[PDB]
């Protein structure tokens, strides 16, 4: 068989574990407690800013960028993830730096999202800076009666390769 081999490192490590197992157990439990703390912290901060592209109220969105050159094709793949329930009133709003990117329609309604179909909703981003400047673009999907985004996404726009 291909049963692996173990060197001096393994027996020294097992000897350390056999002689100092209690301290390892205690410190790993402390580290796990601190990790749960920090993960809950970051999860709550994300819920606050609503920066999760995956978040009752079922949705899933991710934005793909395609193309070099001053004009990029930005396609948002959006999807309703539910057994059988459509989502009527939703709308997408883009947040960009109006001095670097020229978005024609930075806000538009989305079609009735049928559960199970990936809707590609695309736009044409265009770099305006004569010098190569890469700035982030935010996308917020939100209801039409609410003001807090249902979910969000980020895209680091690549360099322009302009003229």
């Amino acid at each position: 068989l291909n049963v692996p081999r173990k060197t001096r490192l393994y027996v020294d490590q097992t000897l350390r574990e056999r002689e100092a197992g209690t301290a390892m157990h205690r410190t790993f439990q402390a580290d796990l407690y601190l990790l749960r703390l920090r993960a809950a912290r970051a999860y709550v901060q994300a819920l606050e800013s609503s920066l999760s592209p995956v978040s009752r109220e079922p949705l899933k969105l991710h934005a793909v960028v395609q193309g070099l050159g001053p004009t990029f094709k930005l396609t948002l793949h959006l999807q309703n993830t539910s057994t059988a329930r459509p989502i009527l009133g939703l709308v997408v709003c883009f947040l960009y730096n109006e001095v670097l990117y020229a978005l024609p329609r930075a806000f538009f309604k989305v079609p009735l999202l049928v559960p199970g179909l990936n809707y590609p909703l695309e736009t044409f981003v265009k770099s305006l800076s004569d010098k190569g400047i890469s700035d982030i673009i935010k996308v917020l999907v939100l209801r039409e009666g609410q003001s807090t985004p249902l979910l969000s996404a980020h895209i680091n726009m690549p360099m322009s390769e302009g003229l």
């Binding site: 990790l35 749960r36 993960a39 809950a40 970051a42 999860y43 994300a46 920066l51 999760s52 592209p53 995956v54 991710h62 934005a63 996404a153 980020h154 895209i155």
Partner: peptide, 14 residues
């Protein structure tokens, strides 16, 4: 905890 960590990996890199 792994659920939260994977969701945060998604939050940081979509």
């Amino acid at each position: 905890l792994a659920h939260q960590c994977f969701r945060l990996a998604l939050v940081s890199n979509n």
